[PDB]
Amino acid sequence: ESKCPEELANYCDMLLRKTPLSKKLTSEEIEAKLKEVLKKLKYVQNKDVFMRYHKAHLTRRLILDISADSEIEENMVEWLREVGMPADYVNKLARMFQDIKVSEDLNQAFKEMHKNNALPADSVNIKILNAGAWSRSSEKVFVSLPTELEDLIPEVEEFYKKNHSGRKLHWHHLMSNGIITFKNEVGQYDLEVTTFQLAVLFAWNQRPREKISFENLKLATELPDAELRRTLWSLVAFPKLKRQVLLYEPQVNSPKDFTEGTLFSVNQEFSLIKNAKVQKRGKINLIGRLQLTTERMREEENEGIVQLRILRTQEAIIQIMKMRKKISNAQLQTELVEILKNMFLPQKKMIKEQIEWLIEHKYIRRDESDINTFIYMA
Amino acid sequence: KKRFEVKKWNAVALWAWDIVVDNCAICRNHIMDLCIECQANQASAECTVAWGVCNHAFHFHCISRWLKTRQVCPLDNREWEFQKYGH
Ligand SMILES: [Zn+2]
Ligand SMILES: [Zn+2]
Ligand SMILES: [Zn+2]
């Protein structure tokens, strides 16, 4: 069912993203299901919501290489063009695939151009996309990278200049991840980690059996408290796992309870348990939901939907006004609902707020003898 | 020969136009601050940002006024197209 546009965007993501559900379905199953959602779109008033969350999900999926089917993923752009989405929305969507294609060519051009040397050449991938279209947050999450990865920054940077001048790269480490080798005392494993997790774990490299406090990790990592808290939590409390990679001091049930003095240490007995028997070797993905949507990002997305609404309502009202020079509130509301028809449905409260804003800004004015009827002026 | 070692890495960078995170180009106040019209006529009855598919960014109020003379980007000269209004 899912009437709510956002539930519908999440659902779509659950099908286009590598997920337990995405795995339990064939192309055809997925495909048909993606269409039985777009169909239900013609009954959604606030279409701008689905469009914005769908695009936000698509962004993570392409930036993180987590599409279940490059095919289905791309064919979705036409499926949207069919159900009637605007050519402008659909077109910027198609623009994102182009951007990725352009990014992957630039990836190789780098991998070969640089067979000469920090790391085994090919083991390093890069993705460089335009900010205006791939950035969704104005917030920047900083992280001090371990030398073993910082020596790459200047490499990738020079390569980009002689290719494109007058440009500047902004590292989006929150969206960076990789694989590392954890050499225990029971074995050695390959952990699919988040770059922030990486930075955190590498803090013990010249002090393997040392305990480090939260505060000191914050100094060595330079992560903002919020991020550091959840990153650390994913390492001392990865769900369902029987043995955590990291151990901490006063026990808690929430990363909120960590304090300056909480001590962390590398568990020298970490191991994967395949067949109830310790495994001296193996591979695990500890990224979890660390690179997926957060509550904060949601408030950000909604603020964006609200910004565009207000702007689009102001333009629509003036426009209707720049046509009739005098109109009744009743009449304004209804032919205004029509122009915003394919985006959302403004509520009376917002309209009054805008109209109100328009009066004090001298674009319109109420009638001399009528608290309603508005008169265009200027 | 340590406990944690990098086997593989996927870095990500989002590009913008070099100069400096400096002010509006059409107008000239900091892209994050008020614009010629707001910071001056904020004496009575919100200068935000807008992007172009060309990845150039200005105050929405400055690039809107300019687009009326010609629908192209002030910096390069390609057909203009709003990419994003979100901050
Ligand atoms: Zn302004
Ligand atoms: Zn431009
Ligand atoms: Zn400006």
UniProtKB/Swiss-Prot annotation, chain A:
Task: List, for all copies, the residue spans of the domain called Cullin neddylation.
Answer: 309-370
Q: What is the effect of changing R289A?
A: Impaired interaction with ARIH2
Consequence of changing K322R: Abolished neddylation and interaction with ARIH2
Signal peptide positions on this chain: none
Cross-link Glycyl lysine isopeptide (Lys-Gly) (interchain with G-Cter in NEDD8) mapped to chain: K322
Post-translational modifications: Neddylated; which enhances the ubiquitination activity of ECS complexes and prevents binding of the inhibitor CAND1. Deneddylated via its interaction with the COP9 signalosome (CSN).
- The set of disulfide-linked cysteines is none
How changing R60A affects the protein?
Answer: Impaired interaction with ARIH2
Subcellular location per UniProt equals: Nucleus
Q: How does it assemble?
A: Component of multiple cullin-5-RING E3 ubiquitin-protein ligase complexes (ECS complexes, also named CRL5 complexes) formed of CUL5, Elongin BC (ELOB and ELOC), RNF7/RBX2 and a variable SOCS box domain-containing protein as substrate-specific recognition component. CUL5-containing ECS complexes specifically contain RNF7/RBX2, and not RBX1, as catalytic subunit. Component of the ECS(ASB2) complex with the substrate recognition component ASB2. Component of the ECS(ASB6) complex with the substrate recognition component ASB6. (Microbial infection) Interacts (via the substrate recognition component) with HIV-1 Vif; forming an active cullin-5-RING E3 ubiquitin-protein ligase complex (ECS complex).
Q: What family name appears in the similarity comment?
A: Belongs to the cullin family.
Role noted for this protein: Core component of multiple cullin-5-RING E3 ubiquitin-protein ligase complexes (ECS complexes, also named CRL5 complexes), which mediate the ubiquitination and subsequent proteasomal degradation of target proteins. Acts a scaffold protein that contributes to catalysis through positioning of the substrate and the ubiquitin-conjugating enzyme. The functional specificity of the E3 ubiquitin-protein ligase complex depends on the variable SOCS box-containing substrate recognition component.
> What is the protein's given name?
Cullin-5
Q: What is the lineage of its organism?
A: Eukaryota, Metazoa, Chordata, Craniata, Vertebrata
- Name the encoding gene, please: CUL5
Swiss-Prot record, chain B:
- Gene Ontology biological process terms, A to Z: cellular response to amino acid stimulus; cellular response to chemical stress; cellular response to oxidative stress; cellular response to UV; DNA damage response; MAPK cascade; negative regulation of canonical Wnt signaling pathway; negative regulation of insulin receptor signaling pathway
| GO CC term, one of those recorded | cullin-RING ubiquitin ligase complex
Q: What is its EC number?
A: 2.3.2.27, 2.3.2.32
The positions annotated for binding Zn(2+) 3 are C54, H56, C73, D76
- Annotated residues for binding of Zn(2+) 1: C24, C27, H59, C62
What pathway annotation does it carry?
Protein modification; protein ubiquitination; Protein modification; protein neddylation
Name the keywords, alphabetized.
Acetylation, Cytoplasm, DNA damage, DNA repair, Host-virus interaction, Metal-binding, Nucleus, Phosphoprotein, Transferase, Ubl conjugation pathway, Zinc, Zinc-finger
Give tissue specificity per the record.
Answer: Widely expressed.
Q: What is known of its domains?
A: The RING-type zinc finger domain is essential for ubiquitin ligase activity. It coordinates an additional third zinc ion.
Family per similarity comment? Belongs to the RING-box family.
Function (record text): E3 ubiquitin ligase component of multiple cullin-RING-based E3 ubiquitin-protein ligase (CRLs) complexes which mediate the ubiquitination and subsequent proteasomal degradation of target proteins, including proteins involved in cell cycle progression, signal transduction, transcription and transcription-coupled nucleotide excision repair. CRLs complexes and ARIH1 collaborate in tandem to mediate ubiquitination of target proteins, ARIH1 mediating addition of the first ubiquitin on CRLs targets.
Q: What is this protein called?
A: E3 ubiquitin-protein ligase RBX1
Q: Which organism is it from?
A: Homo sapiens
Q: Complete protein: which residues are present? A: 19 to 108 of 108
